[PDB]
Design a protein around this motif. Structure first.
Motif, PDB file in Angstrom:
ATOM      1  N   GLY A   1      61.444 -24.278  31.520  1.00  0.00           N
ATOM      2  CA  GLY A   1      62.781 -24.726  31.175  1.00  0.00           C
ATOM      3  C   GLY A   1      63.561 -25.148  32.405  1.00  0.00           C
ATOM      4  N   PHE A   2      64.573 -25.989  32.178  1.00  0.00           N
ATOM      5  CA  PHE A   2      65.439 -26.423  33.269  1.00  0.00           C
ATOM      6  C   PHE A   2      66.284 -25.276  33.808  1.00  0.00           C
ATOM      7  CE2 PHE A   2      69.902 -27.662  34.061  1.00  0.00           C
ATOM      8  CZ  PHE A   2      69.747 -28.248  35.298  1.00  0.00           C
ATOM      9  N   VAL A   3      66.643 -24.318  32.949  1.00  0.00           N
ATOM     10  CA  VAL A   3      67.439 -23.177  33.391  1.00  0.00           C
ATOM     11  C   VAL A   3      66.662 -22.343  34.399  1.00  0.00           C
ATOM     12  CG1 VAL A   3      68.494 -21.023  32.640  1.00  0.00           C
ATOM     13  CG2 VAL A   3      68.861 -23.113  31.321  1.00  0.00           C
ATOM     14  N   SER A   4      65.373 -22.116  34.137  1.00  0.00           N
ATOM     15  CA  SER A   4      64.570 -21.268  35.009  1.00  0.00           C
ATOM     16  C   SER A   4      64.406 -21.854  36.405  1.00  0.00           C
ATOM     17  CB  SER A   4      63.197 -21.026  34.382  1.00  0.00           C
ATOM     18  OG  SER A   4      63.286 -20.125  33.293  1.00  0.00           O
ATOM     19  N   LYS A   5      64.624 -23.158  36.575  1.00  0.00           N
ATOM     20  CA  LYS A   5      64.463 -23.806  37.868  1.00  0.00           C
ATOM     21  C   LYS A   5      65.769 -23.959  38.638  1.00  0.00           C
ATOM     22  CE  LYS A   5      60.168 -24.301  36.814  1.00  0.00           C
ATOM     23  NZ  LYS A   5      60.439 -23.735  35.467  1.00  0.00           N
ATOM     24  N   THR A   6      66.904 -23.595  38.046  1.00  0.00           N
ATOM     25  CA  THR A   6      68.202 -23.730  38.695  1.00  0.00           C
ATOM     26  C   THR A   6      68.943 -22.405  38.627  1.00  0.00           C
ATOM     27  OG1 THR A   6      69.069 -24.646  36.621  1.00  0.00           O
ATOM     28  CG2 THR A   6      68.484 -26.204  38.365  1.00  0.00           C
ATOM     29  N   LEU A   7      69.713 -22.108  39.671  1.00  0.00           N
ATOM     30  CA  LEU A   7      70.485 -20.871  39.747  1.00  0.00           C
ATOM     31  C   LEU A   7      71.969 -21.227  39.763  1.00  0.00           C
ATOM     32  CD1 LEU A   7      68.477 -18.503  42.092  1.00  0.00           C
ATOM     33  CD2 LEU A   7      68.150 -19.141  39.695  1.00  0.00           C
ATOM     34  N   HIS A   8      72.518 -21.472  38.576  1.00  0.00           N
ATOM     35  CA  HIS A   8      73.959 -21.639  38.433  1.00  0.00           C
ATOM     36  C   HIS A   8      74.540 -20.953  37.206  1.00  0.00           C
ATOM     37  CE1 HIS A   8      73.599 -24.638  35.187  1.00  0.00           C
ATOM     38  NE2 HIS A   8      72.524 -25.040  35.839  1.00  0.00           N
ATOM     39  N   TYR A   9      73.725 -20.536  36.234  1.00  0.00           N
ATOM     40  CA  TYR A   9      74.242 -19.752  35.119  1.00  0.00           C
ATOM     41  C   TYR A   9      74.535 -18.319  35.541  1.00  0.00           C
ATOM     42  CZ  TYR A   9      73.098 -23.384  31.644  1.00  0.00           C
ATOM     43  OH  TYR A   9      73.041 -24.548  30.912  1.00  0.00           O
ATOM     44  N   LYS A  10      73.777 -17.802  36.505  1.00  0.00           N
ATOM     45  CA  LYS A  10      73.892 -16.429  36.973  1.00  0.00           C
ATOM     46  C   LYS A  10      74.806 -16.291  38.186  1.00  0.00           C
ATOM     47  CE  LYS A  10      70.366 -14.597  39.120  1.00  0.00           C
ATOM     48  NZ  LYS A  10      68.980 -14.113  39.377  1.00  0.00           N
ATOM     49  N   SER A  11      75.472 -17.370  38.596  1.00  0.00           N
ATOM     50  CA  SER A  11      76.501 -17.311  39.623  1.00  0.00           C
ATOM     51  C   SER A  11      77.857 -17.801  39.134  1.00  0.00           C
ATOM     52  CB  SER A  11      76.076 -18.120  40.857  1.00  0.00           C
ATOM     53  OG  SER A  11      75.923 -19.495  40.549  1.00  0.00           O
ATOM     54  N   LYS A  12      77.951 -18.284  37.896  1.00  0.00           N
ATOM     55  CA  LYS A  12      79.210 -18.760  37.337  1.00  0.00           C
ATOM     56  C   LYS A  12      79.245 -18.419  35.854  1.00  0.00           C
ATOM     57  CE  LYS A  12      77.794 -22.196  39.284  1.00  0.00           C
ATOM     58  NZ  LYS A  12      77.169 -21.838  40.587  1.00  0.00           N
ATOM     59  N   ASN A  13      80.447 -18.455  35.281  1.00  0.00           N
ATOM     60  CA  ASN A  13      80.615 -18.098  33.879  1.00  0.00           C
ATOM     61  C   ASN A  13      80.091 -19.219  32.978  1.00  0.00           C
ATOM     62  OD1 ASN A  13      82.608 -19.858  34.613  1.00  0.00           O
ATOM     63  ND2 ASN A  13      84.325 -18.611  33.887  1.00  0.00           N
ATOM     64  N   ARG A  14      80.292 -19.046  31.669  1.00  0.00           N
ATOM     65  CA  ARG A  14      79.662 -19.933  30.693  1.00  0.00           C
ATOM     66  C   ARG A  14      80.149 -21.372  30.839  1.00  0.00           C
ATOM     67  NH1 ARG A  14      80.549 -16.956  24.993  1.00  0.00           N
ATOM     68  NH2 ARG A  14      82.578 -16.546  25.970  1.00  0.00           N
ATOM     69  N   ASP A  15      81.469 -21.575  30.846  1.00  0.00           N
ATOM     70  CA  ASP A  15      82.003 -22.935  30.829  1.00  0.00           C
ATOM     71  C   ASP A  15      81.724 -23.663  32.140  1.00  0.00           C
ATOM     72  OD1 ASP A  15      83.967 -21.740  32.560  1.00  0.00           O
ATOM     73  OD2 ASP A  15      85.131 -21.190  30.784  1.00  0.00           O
ATOM     74  N   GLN A  16      81.957 -22.995  33.273  1.00  0.00           N
ATOM     75  CA  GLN A  16      81.753 -23.637  34.569  1.00  0.00           C
ATOM     76  C   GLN A  16      80.290 -24.010  34.771  1.00  0.00           C
ATOM     77  OE1 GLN A  16      82.653 -25.581  37.426  1.00  0.00           O
ATOM     78  NE2 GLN A  16      84.303 -24.072  37.601  1.00  0.00           N
ATOM     79  N   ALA A  17      79.379 -23.080  34.474  1.00  0.00           N
ATOM     80  CA  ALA A  17      77.955 -23.365  34.623  1.00  0.00           C
ATOM     81  C   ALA A  17      77.502 -24.449  33.653  1.00  0.00           C
ATOM     82  CB  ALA A  17      77.136 -22.090  34.424  1.00  0.00           C
ATOM     83  N   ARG A  18      78.016 -24.424  32.421  1.00  0.00           N
ATOM     84  CA  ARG A  18      77.659 -25.446  31.442  1.00  0.00           C
ATOM     85  C   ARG A  18      78.076 -26.831  31.919  1.00  0.00           C
ATOM     86  NH1 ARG A  18      79.130 -25.136  24.919  1.00  0.00           N
ATOM     87  NH2 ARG A  18      76.975 -24.934  24.172  1.00  0.00           N
ATOM     88  N   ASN A  19      79.322 -26.960  32.383  1.00  0.00           N
ATOM     89  CA  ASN A  19      79.805 -28.256  32.847  1.00  0.00           C
ATOM     90  C   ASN A  19      79.075 -28.700  34.109  1.00  0.00           C
ATOM     91  OD1 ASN A  19      83.175 -27.389  31.807  1.00  0.00           O
ATOM     92  ND2 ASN A  19      81.541 -28.440  30.681  1.00  0.00           N
TER      93      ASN A  19
END
Length: 49
Positions: A21-39
Motif C-alpha cells: 500500500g501507499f500508506v506503508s511506504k510513507t510516514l505522514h499519517y503517524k506524524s499528523k492528525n487525520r485531516d492534515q495527513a489526508r490533505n
RNA sequence: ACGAGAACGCAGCACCAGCUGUCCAACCUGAAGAAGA
C-alpha cells in the motif's frame, strides 16, 4: 470473503513486499492528525498521478 | 759552431665490499523493486 484483519496483536505485524500500500511506504499519517495527513497525501499524490 | 747533445715522469692498480623501497591501513557509509483508485 473473510477479511479478518486482526489488530492490537502486541505490535507483531509488519508489511513487507509489493502491493502493501501507499500508506506503508510513507510516514505522514503517524506524524499528523487525520485531516492534515489526508490533505498532505492528496496533494503529494496528485502531483504524482 | 747556443753549459750544450741525446732522454715519454713513465710502468702494475675494478671507486669497489655489505644493505628488501620497506612498515601500519576493510573501497567503506544511508538506501523497501516500489507505489494511483
Amino acid at each position: 470473503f473473510a477479511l479478518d484483519q486482526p489488530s492490537q496483536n502486541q505490535g507483531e505485524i509488519i508489511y513487507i513486499g509489493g502491493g502493501a500500500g501507499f500508506v506503508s511506504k510513507t510516514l505522514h499519517y503517524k506524524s499528523k492528525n487525520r485531516d492534515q495527513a489526508r490533505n498532505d497525501s492528496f496533494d503529494i499524490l496528485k502531483q504524482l498521478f
